[PDB]
Amino acid sequence: GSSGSSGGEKPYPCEICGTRFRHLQTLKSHLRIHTGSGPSSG
Ligand SMILES: [Zn+2]
Numbered sequence: 001g002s003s004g005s006s007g008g009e010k011p012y013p014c015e016i017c018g019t020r021f022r023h024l025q026t027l028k029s030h031l032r033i034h035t036g037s038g039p040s041s042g
Pocket residue numbers: 014015016017018019030031034
């Protein structure tokens with residue numbers, strides 16, 4: 001259906017893949033594995 005908040009667990013769905021995260025601040029860090037071509041971020 002619609003995309004956005006959920007209202008329970010991981011109301012902050014990822015933008016790259018989609019994997020949600022209990023908290024937002026956390027998700028932002030989950031984007032590190034998504035973007036990072038080279039010696040940066042691994
Ligand atoms: Zn993701």
